[PDB]
Symmetry: D2
Subunit: 237 residues, 4 copies
């Protein structure tokens, strides 16, 4: 199977697989069962922003999620990503719906990684920022139901013409270029990611959520990963 590190914005409490009984943000290291969670006061139909940060010195993966005019939610987990992920990875966004549904609309997404070596000319860096997604967005690998270019957004899961989110949908978008997250002369490696999302559901119980993830470069949507598994994991182990 793939190797996954993810920050999940989990809109549906599956308490049977260890979610808390509320929408939450979580850090997922090789399992959908988050290593750490925090309560998230998800706002149906509002545009939210998630920020994810990490560096190889502190070895702490942290995320903050917020909406305008509201208090944020934050979660952190100590993990050495060099011990979890391969040296080259892809980074992406995933979302899913199941029997419950919601739009999983991404309005912007940015990412920066930096590897600073001990050579005085120190830095290798990659940065991208999408504030509009085009119908044929060649620097993204879209998987599953993900589409780009509808109102200039990235729709990770299926939405009908009329704006209605569909159930049992899964979709991901990965940045085209592999990302180097370790180098042998690196003295500091860091990354940050930000994305803005609009999750709306005609229903009181939206599902299932959106994740920012980092994976093996050849990562693909696991069989049966609609719903609670967020398009990230083959099972709930």
């Amino acid at each position: 199977a793939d190797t996954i590190v993810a920050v999940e914005l989990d809109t549906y409490p599956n308490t049977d697989i260890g979610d808390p009984s509320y929408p939450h943000i979580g850090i997922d290291i090789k399992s959908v069962r988050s290593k750490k969670t925090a309560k998230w006061n998800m706002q149906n139909g509002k545009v939210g922003t998630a920020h994810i940060i990490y560096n190889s010195v502190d070895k702490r993966l942290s995320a903050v999620v917020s909406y305008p005019n509201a208090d944020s939610a934050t979660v952190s987990y100590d993990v050495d990503l060099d011990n979890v992920l391969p040296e080259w990875v892809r980074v992406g966004l995933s979302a899913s719906t199941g029997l419950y549904k919601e739009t999983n609309t991404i309005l912007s997404w940015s990412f920066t990684s930096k590897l600073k070596s001990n050579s005085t000319h120190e830095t290798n860096a990659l940065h991208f920022m999408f504030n509009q997604f085009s119908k044929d967005q060649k620097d993204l690998i879209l998987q599953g139901d993900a589409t780009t270019g509808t109102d200039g957004n990235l729709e990770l899961t299926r939405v009908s013409s009329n704006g209605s989110p569909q159930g049992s949908s899964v979709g991901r978008a990965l940045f085209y270029a592999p990302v180097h997250i370790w180098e042998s002369s690196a003295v500091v490696a860091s990354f940050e990611a930000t994305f803005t999302f609009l999750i709306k559901s005609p229903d009181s119980h939206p599902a299932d959520g959106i994740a920012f993830f980092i994976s093996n470069i050849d990562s693909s949507i696991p069989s049966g990963s609609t719903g609670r598994l967020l398009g990230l994991f083959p099972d709930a182990n």
Copy 2:
């Protein structure tokens, strides 16, 4: 054939195909016969830096090349790149040797492109910076004789164990991710590139040069483009 836009650092005067009778920097639009050139006081064995800039408002492709402690050389050409290149491109470095030879060593390479739309959330951007190249540099597509990881550099053309550059060599490196250089809601599109290079030759007459180029995404080394054609063009038309 491919579509090429390039800034050439041409170390060998091929006066039969319109080079001036000295090493020069040139702007090449769909032809090796530069649309504009400037004299370049190339310094054998010294590390030089080239800077290339362009934006869609001014529609002027400009480059400056310099060495420490020396006056720079600059060349500019008015060209609307949106009328030359496709909407998606790859960007890269190329170099070649022929019967005359030189190392075509790249010590660093950075690139930024920005498309700013009329939406208040305006910007799509891509930036990369390499200050060290690793043996398996997965975010570069190496073509021809190009190799990475020898002393942490990108050697565009063949060099033997002993540091000796080889003749009749051609090599390119393209960044892995396609680059979007036009979008329909863009009000300004710009790019800049910088690279540092070390061209050294045991010979009085080094050849052939290094170019930064932008091409169709599927660009490949043209048959017979060693030597004066810089790994960019199939012929000298």
Copy 3:
């Protein structure tokens, strides 16, 4: 008097001092009488974005102004800023009202300057980005009627409690740190600025406009520069 280089968003046609008979964007070099203008379809009450770009190789000051969903306006003028401005400058935003009035609200402002030398460690850079202005914004020098922190914006000219713009108002905001726009070993110097603004007026004839400007470091609002002179110039010469 001060030395001013500015891009003006001129909302009021003063045809007696050479404005065209419509709202326009202009490049002003040491005079309010723009060296170059373009028609601007200013939208009362809508948030617009202005982008300004320049580099020392091309020596062309260009600006683009746009609103969402609308075609942009652009203006360019060939000028060597090193021959106009001192080596150190401040950069800022200015606006004014006169007998006609409008809000001159700045919602965001960013600026980047870069000087790249011929030393392989090439770059001196300054960048700032404001997306919210705080009541006591210590890295801005506010002049005249400019205030910060009202709804997190920079109000360049006086607005009453009720949101009503006041006539005969002038205000500027300059970034606190001087900016180096030339250095003796520089081979390329460039800058870009972006700001977002909301100009609204209860009146059919708003006035007078907003400018991004660059000036001597000690620049101050000229006596009698309310109205058509945009807080930039002492007279209309």
Copy 4:
């Protein structure tokens, strides 16, 4: 007295004030007696690089110092800087000599701070990068013996014509613009700093070291802070 947060590169072991018995890197929170240190294999006459990182989510101030071809040294300390520093600060470099001496030469210095709010237009940022310092470097406040423009470097402490470092010297350089390190709607605040330095001494026992620091905006060199106090503190409490 001022409020100081600093990362020290302490070249001289003053074991009487709690330094370890070797050159070390340290995190100093309101005291010269570092809260955390790590051994540093300082290399006399070689150019080293220090990197400092912090964010308000993790509340961990970390630094890494390295030389080319050598293993790095790193130190971290959990501290909420919002509880130590005022909301606006200046950032700078300090160094000193005492009865023992060394050059305290800064060859480059860069700094980025970011405050990201919960408003979807999230970011306030400041970034500067110096790779050459000019004789009259108007965006730096030089204090004590600090000078700029000698070989394009920042010499924090006194050096004679002949390159000889002088004893009993203290000097600092602060960036001109205040820096906002907290805002009330901020959900993440972060900073990073990097500088490159050349510490050389004709003596076996160089002293005293270089620090990157953050202080009240009006920070000044404390009386009697030559030597072990690094130009940062009035005493060794």
